[PDB]
Design a protein around this ligand. Structure first.
Ligand code: HEM
Length: 388
């Protein structure tokens, strides 16, 4: 059983992963804890399994293929229905299309302010620090109903939980600080925002104040690093594909920014193999039998380069790929990304505004000088020096 997970093509999935996808759609791999879960590479099969009620997201179950030991420790996103949906229903409305369309001015203002700071400051500048990290956490603060004046505090806490050079002890203090704060804010709300909605539930007896705070925390975590990685990696992908950058920037067709975000989501699949399940019952698929209690690993980045679905050079960026929106970058089934509409719309605004306001944007060095997050689960770059 090969080890899992398996450099000068840094955007591309690992070579062994492309090999599996091509010749062993379903196979076993040994992960960090010595278990050998199934690896499911095909887009079709990921959809099949992820929407099969025999497939469980319950990380307390023996066999569950946790991403790493730390994720194992932590152990609504890690639960099955009915409790998963009971909780998800309480935070569904603010993420719906209409409500996210209604956030466009707020996301646009956040973006323009941060581009104002870039443009007043030195160059080159790290796009990660200047834009990619601040936007998503600021947007989520606003949906939560975090007062403007506590913004920087929540941002630094959340940043601290993301940095490689934060010592775990400090990351945990930062996490403790977020929870205490959110719990306090929920007590306060007892507004229009998520925490007010959650305060209603608290007041109704449906969840505790602690639970309210945990949900808040979870939305904070979930929506931050992922979106940041997309901002930074997505920008870099555009800068490495200049003819396509120019089009996204300069096209008069509003569909192009829309397509570009989907093709970026598909091309980069930053959530990689973070999607994990366990079979609750035996499941027969693709001529093998996944047995009850066996783990299942979903390399979304394999599915999104699947030639059954993306036959025309899926290993190249093509913003006109007519098919891109079929990607599974936000996963699939009942745990499909709650923020998927928000993310789409955040990236449309960030990429378009970044390129229209900084039409001379340029990588300050070259691709090979960029430090990628090869050593992590979520794909991305530690730093992105840009100039103009
Ligand atoms: C590029 C941006 C994003 C990507 C690639 C992404 C990816 C994903 C993926 C793959 C999952 C599925 C996890 C699983 O099945 O185990 C997921 C779930 C989730 N995402 Fe995102 N996400 C993004 C942005 C956001 C944002 C902006 C938010 C919230 C504000 C968010 C909140 C969530 C939540 C709450 C879940 C759990 C859904 C559930 O279990 O019912 N995400 N995301």
């Amino acid at each position: 059983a090969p080890e899992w997970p398996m450099t000068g093509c840094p955007f591309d999935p690992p070579p062994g992963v492309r090999k599996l996808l091509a010749e062993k759609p379903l196979s076993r791999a040994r992960i960090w804890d010595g278990s050998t879960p199934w690896v499911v590479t095909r887009h079709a099969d990921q959809r099949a399994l992820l929407s099969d009620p025999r497939v469980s997201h319950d990380g307390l179950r023996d066999g569950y293929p946790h991403i790493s030991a730390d994720f194992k420790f932590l152990s609504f996103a890690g639960q099955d229905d009915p409790e998963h949906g009971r909780i998800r229903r309480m935070v569904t409305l603010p993420f719906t299309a209409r409500r996210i369309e209604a956030m466009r001015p707020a996301i646009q203002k956040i973006t323009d302010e941060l581009i104002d700071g870039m443009l007043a400051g030195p160059k080159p500048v790290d796009l990660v620090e200047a834009l990619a990290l601040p936007v998503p956490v600021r947007v989520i603060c606003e949906m939560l109903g975090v007062p403007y004046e506590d913004r920087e505090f929540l941002q630094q806490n959340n940043n601290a939980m993301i940095y490689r050079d934060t010592a775990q002890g400090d990351a945990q203090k930062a996490a403790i600080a977020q929870a205490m704060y959110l719990k306090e804010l929920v007590g306060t709300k007892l507004g229009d925002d998520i925490l007010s909605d959650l305060a209603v539930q608290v007041e109704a007896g449906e969840i505790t104040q602690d639970d309210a705070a945990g949900i808040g925390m979870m939305l904070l975590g979930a929506g931050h690093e992922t979106t940041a990685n997309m901002i930074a990696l997505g920008t870099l992908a555009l800068l490495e594909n200049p003819e396509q950058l120019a089009e996204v920037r300069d096209s008069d067709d509003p569909k192009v920014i829309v397509n570009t975000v989907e093709e970026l989501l598909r091309y980069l699949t930053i959530a990689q193999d973070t999607v994990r399940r366990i079979a609750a019952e035996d499941i027969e698929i693709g001529g093998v039998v996944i047995k009850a209690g066996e783990g299942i690993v979903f390399p979304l980045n394999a599915a999104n380069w699947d030639p059954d679905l993306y036959p025309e050079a899926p290993d190249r960026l093509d913003i006109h790929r007519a098919n891109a929106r079929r990607h599974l970058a936000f996963g699939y089934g009942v745990h499909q990304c709650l923020g998927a509409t928000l993310a789409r719309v955040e990236l449309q605004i960030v990429y378009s505004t970044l390129l229209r306001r900084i039409p001379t944007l340029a990588l300050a060095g070259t691709l090979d000088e960029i430090p990628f997050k090869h050593d992590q689960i979520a794909h991305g770059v530690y730093e992105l020096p840009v100039t103009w």
